[PDB]
Amino acid sequence: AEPDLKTALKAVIPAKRELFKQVKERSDEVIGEVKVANVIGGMRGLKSMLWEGSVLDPEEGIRFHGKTIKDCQKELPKGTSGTEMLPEAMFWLLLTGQVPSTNQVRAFSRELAEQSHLPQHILDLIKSFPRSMHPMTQLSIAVAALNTESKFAKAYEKGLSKADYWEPTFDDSISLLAKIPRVAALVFRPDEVDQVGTQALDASQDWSYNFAELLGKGGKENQDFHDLLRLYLALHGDHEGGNVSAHATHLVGSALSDPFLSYSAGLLGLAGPLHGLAAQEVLRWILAMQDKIGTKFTDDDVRNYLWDTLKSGRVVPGYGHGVLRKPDPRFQALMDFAATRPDVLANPVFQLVKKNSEIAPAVLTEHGKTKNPHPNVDAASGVLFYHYGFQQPLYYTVTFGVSRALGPLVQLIWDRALGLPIERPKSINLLGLKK
Amino acid sequence: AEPDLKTALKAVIPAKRELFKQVKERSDEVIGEVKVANVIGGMRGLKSMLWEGSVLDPEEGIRFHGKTIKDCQKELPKGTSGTEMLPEAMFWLLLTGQVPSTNQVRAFSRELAEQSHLPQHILDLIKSFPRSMHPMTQLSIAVAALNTESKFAKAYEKGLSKADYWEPTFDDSISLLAKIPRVAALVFRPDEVDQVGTQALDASQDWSYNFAELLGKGGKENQDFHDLLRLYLALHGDHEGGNVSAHATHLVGSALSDPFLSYSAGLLGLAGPLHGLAAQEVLRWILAMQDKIGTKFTDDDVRNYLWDTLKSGRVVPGYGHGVLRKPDPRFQALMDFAATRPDVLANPVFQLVKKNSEIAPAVLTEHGKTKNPHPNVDAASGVLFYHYGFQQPLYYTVTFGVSRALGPLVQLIWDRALGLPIERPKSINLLGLKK
Ligand SMILES: CC(C)(COP(=O)(O)OP(=O)(O)OC[C@H]1O[C@@H](n2cnc3c(N)ncnc32)[C@H](O)[C@@H]1OP(=O)(O)O)[C@@H](O)C(=O)NCCC(=O)NCCS
Ligand SMILES: O=C([O-])CC(=O)C(=O)O
Ligand SMILES: O=C([O-])CC(=O)C(=O)O
Ligand SMILES: O=C([O-])CC(=O)C(=O)O
Numbered sequence: 001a002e003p004d005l006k007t008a009l010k011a012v013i014p015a016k017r018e019l020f021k022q023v024k025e026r027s028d029e030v031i032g033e034v035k036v037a038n039v040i041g042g043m044r045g046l047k048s049m050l051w052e053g054s055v056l057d058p059e060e061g062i063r064f065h066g067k068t069i070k071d072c073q074k075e076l077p078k079g080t081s082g083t084e085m086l087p088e089a090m091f092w093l094l095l096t097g098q099v100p101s102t103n104q105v106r107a108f109s110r111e112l113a114e115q116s117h118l119p120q121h122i123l124d125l126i127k128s129f130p131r132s133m134h135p136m137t138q139l140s141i142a143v144a145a146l147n148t149e150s151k152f153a154k155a156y157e158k159g160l161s162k163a164d165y166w167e168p169t170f171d172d173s174i175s176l177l178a179k180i181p182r183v184a185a186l187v188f189r190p191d192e193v194d195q196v197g198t199q200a201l202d203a204s205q206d207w208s209y210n211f212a213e214l215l216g217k218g219g220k221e222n223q224d225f226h227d228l229l230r231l232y233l234a235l236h237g238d239h240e241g242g243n244v245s246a247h248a249t250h251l252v253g254s255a256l257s258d259p260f261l262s263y264s265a266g267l268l269g270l271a272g273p274l275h276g277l278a279a280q281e282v283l284r285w286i287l288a289m290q291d292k293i294g295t296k297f298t299d300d301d302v303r304n305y306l307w308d309t310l311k312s313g314r315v316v317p318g319y320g321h322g323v324l325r326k327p328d329p330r331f332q333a334l335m336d337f338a339a340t341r342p343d344v345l346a347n348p349v350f351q352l353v354k355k356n357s358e359i360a361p362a363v364l365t366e367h368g369k370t371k372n373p374h375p376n377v378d379a380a381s382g383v384l385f386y387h388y389g390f391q392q393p394l395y396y397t398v399t400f401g402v403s404r405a406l407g408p409l410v411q412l413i414w415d416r417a418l419g420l421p422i423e424r425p426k427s428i429n430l431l432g433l434k435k
Numbered sequence: 436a437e438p439d440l441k442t443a444l445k446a447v448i449p450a451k452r453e454l455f456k457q458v459k460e461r462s463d464e465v466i467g468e469v470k471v472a473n474v475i476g477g478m479r480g481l482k483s484m485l486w487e488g489s490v491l492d493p494e495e496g497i498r499f500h501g502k503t504i505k506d507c508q509k510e511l512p513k514g515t516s517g518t519e520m521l522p523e524a525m526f527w528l529l530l531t532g533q534v535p536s537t538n539q540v541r542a543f544s545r546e547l548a549e550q551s552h553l554p555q556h557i558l559d560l561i562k563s564f565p566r567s568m569h570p571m572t573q574l575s576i577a578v579a580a581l582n583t584e585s586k587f588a589k590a591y592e593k594g595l596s597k598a599d600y601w602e603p604t605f606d607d608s609i610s611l612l613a614k615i616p617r618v619a620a621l622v623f624r625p626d627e628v629d630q631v632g633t634q635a636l637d638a639s640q641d642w643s644y645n646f647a648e649l650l651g652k653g654g655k656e657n658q659d660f661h662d663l664l665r666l667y668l669a670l671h672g673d674h675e676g677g678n679v680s681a682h683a684t685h686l687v688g689s690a691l692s693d694p695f696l697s698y699s700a701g702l703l704g705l706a707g708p709l710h711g712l713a714a715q716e717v718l719r720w721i722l723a724m725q726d727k728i729g730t731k732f733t734d735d736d737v738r739n740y741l742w743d744t745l746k747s748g749r750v751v752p753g754y755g756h757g758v759l760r761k762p763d764p765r766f767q768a769l770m771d772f773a774a775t776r777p778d779v780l781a782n783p784v785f786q787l788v789k790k791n792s793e794i795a796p797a798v799l800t801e802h803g804k805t806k807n808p809h810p811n812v813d814a815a816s817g818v819l820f821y822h823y824g825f826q827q828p829l830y831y832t833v834t835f836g837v838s839r840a841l842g843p844l845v846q847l848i849w850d851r852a853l854g855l856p857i858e859r860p861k862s863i864n865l866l867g868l869k870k
Contacts (some may be wrong), residue, residue, distance in 0.1 A: 241862030255707020272690020313596030427676030
């Protein structure tokens with residue numbers, strides 16, 4: 001056997017700690033300014049937090065340990081079938097800063113299958129949800145409810161040494177990762193909780209495949225979607241630290257809440273319309289537009305629907321970003337996935353998304369409120385699930401929730417390993433800013 | 436009939452918006468520096484966020500709209516019985532910036548009783564929790580599950596103008612405030628869910644009274660505790676924006692998650708040992724000390740127990756603070772509550788807390804590690820509940836959760852009224868700080 005993930009982590013921990021010691025010697029160095037805009041504009045442009053596994057360039061998009069999406073697509077191991085990079089390999093990369101071998105990822109995928117089972121009480125809890133409860137509300141709750149399984153909480157409560165916080169944090173992160181797909185599947189399939197909640201995973205298969213199996217999309221006849229799902233989950237894993245869900249996870253984590261509670265809070269932030277609930281909102285908005293404009297439509301019909309949306313005092317979902325000033329390479333990667341599949345390009349809903357990406361930026365620029373008129377990844381993700389038969393847009397952000405566990409759980413482990421403190425900015429009132 | 440809370444808010448909204456417009460003209464003005472310490476040290480000392488209702492004074496401790504705790508104790512309306520300021524009146528003050536009349540508060544207390552009822556599903560959900568599930572995990576979950584009752588989420592989902600965000604946000608905040616005590620009581624009393632979950636509240640009684648009734652502590656014989664609970668909840672409502680629970684609520688709120696989801700995340704942050712658990716930790720530490728030193732003890736017995744605690748590499752809980760450099764006026768207010776109650780002063784556990792506050796600061800200073808050797812509010816809060824028969828310290832953070840809804844829900848309403856954007860800072864890795 002090659003080194004397992006935990007062993008791989010331990011090898012890189014001392015080097016990171018030494019680097020932390022060196023960065024700390026320069027604590028007093030000025031790296032920027034705070035202005036009034038930063039305070040009133042939700043900390044926009046303010047480099048104020050540490051995130052190790054990914055950094056976002058506004059012009060060029062995301063890099064994971066200095067590697068582009070395309071670099072990751074080429075370098076990360078693939079599944080037993082298919083052409084797309086595995087999220088579990090992305091997780092490995094994020095955590096260790098090193099690309100895993102295919103063997104190492106297979107061993108890791110196998111561990112994730114083994115640890116996906118849920119305690120009976122989580123099944124009972126999910127069964128208590130009324131049918132109408134929003135799916136992200138369900139997902140967030142069930143993840144927090146898994147804090148009964150937390151080794152970190154129990155170890156912290158028993159007395160535990162600061163240097164060894166990361167191990168329980170890591171154990172919990174792997175546990176949450178293994179379980180969350182199944183939880184997510186229970187949200188998708190409320191009538192089939194007893195079967196879905198206990199059904200065995202194929203032990204020889206990757207995370208995305210098993211997530212699809214639990215969704216009712218397993219086997220060879222669904223292998224194209226397995227590839228989409230793999231790509232999708234790996235693309236949404238991490239997008240630096242400033243995004244609401246990552247940040248919330250870190251923030252709640254910094255008070256030494258365990259990873260289930262911490263990432264529950266992530267999920268609550270991800271449920272925000274301005275954040276990941278945009279994936280849902282994009283496709284609902286696109287379907288509404290389709291109903292209004294019909295099968296045969298002009299550019300103006302699309303232009304008018306966007307302008308009407310803006311004039312209603314609503315956002316155009318799937319366009320804009322707190323950091324990016326160009327089209328999101330995650331968005332482009334999903335469009336390129338579509339580009340080689342003629343049945344997807346023929347899907348009228350996808351065509352509408354494509355057409356909308358050609359018109360929305362001009363309209364958004366004419367409106368002139370947004371810093372970034374370009375599409376983000378949420379513009380394209382939902383239409384792709386729709387194409388493969390996931391046609392209830394209320395569930396779309398749930399799949400994002402599974403993905404977005406990856407980066408933030410990585411960061412929590414590092415936060416505990418480094419001994420990073422509680423997150424505690426200073427606030428001030430408007431009268432205080434005026435003085 | 437005098438203006439209701441919503442009407443009182445509406446009168447002050449345009450003035451706040453005008454001030455916001457003026458502060459915005461000076462967006463480009465530099466108010467501070469970012470250093471490396473800020474990035475690695477959890478944004479400590481970094482003025483980066485807006486919080487309107489409370490500001491922390493280094494000499495004087497927290498002030499609510501410029502008013503001290505003692506100012507609030509004198510000016511805020513009291514209940515039909517008792518001498519302590521009502522939390523609902525604190526909420527009013529936080530929100531409106533003005534002290535309510537007793538009439539106005541009675542009308543508001545009546546609305547809170549009327550809206551405390553829960554959907555049947557919340558009862559079923561709470562019933563599903565295993566006995567061992569941590570109480571803060573229970574509280575956080577149930578609050579998030581109340582997002583089925585969210586007007587903001589349903590209005591947002593139906594299409595809603597940005598200008599109209601605050602009213603649904605306000606409606607939800609009042610709804611959450613009315614309901615949370617009952618939820619909190621269900622966590623305290625897992626065997627009494629059917630009774631506590633449905634019991635009608637006296638609409639002519641204040642929030643804290645009804646919370647006590649649901650706790651099993653109603654009626655004249657418990658009126659002292661009603662006063663404690665009132666004081667306690669009003670003191671813990673708000674403590675700037677930088678604290679984890681407030682911040683988390685704001686952060687998740689900024690992506691336009693409703694107040695149930697947003698404050699659920701607050702509660703998850705409050706569940707963190709470094710945030711919400713201190714009250715519990717103090718009393719366990721005090722009871723440990725009491726078991727060793729006994730009912731009759733000398734200063735030295737206490738001195739030795741503190742020195743032993745510090746030499747074991749542990750904190751003396753309830754002393755220190757991220758901001759405060761003086762004894763906390765919240766702490767002093769709780770000690771002064773005890774001062775007029777001879778049975779409390781006679782309680783050996785309270786005497787030990789008092790005695791410890793006379794000795795701990797010197798010892799902490801001699802040890803020399805801490806910046807702030809003075810007691811914070813957590814030093815005193817737990818012993819007082821213990822005196823009135825709440826002797827499971829595990830549930831003390833739950834009562835904090837009820838209190839800490841106040842300030843952050845206020846801030847959310849203001850965030851939506853002002854049109855504040857998503858909170859989305861820039862992050863950076865250690866390698867980026869090194870270069
Ligand atoms: C992503 C987003 C939340 C970023 O927020 P931000 O960084 O604060 O946005 P900006 O700095 O560009 O905001 C400046 C103004 O343009 C507006 N704006 C930005 N993007 C917009 C969009 N897609 N549609 C309408 N208005 C937008 C903002 O609301 C703000 O106006 P306001 O003062 O009237 O609120 C925002 O651009 C957006 O897209 N909102 C919709 C959510 C979405 O589609 N995707 C989220 C997943 S990345
Ligand atoms: O149409 C919806 O809103 C989703 C729905 O009925 C369900 O499956 O519960
Ligand atoms: O980066 C952001 O601000 C939000 C986002 O799209 C992501 O998390 O990928
Ligand atoms: O706990 C804290 O962050 C505050 C403190 O006592 C210190 O810095 O010495």
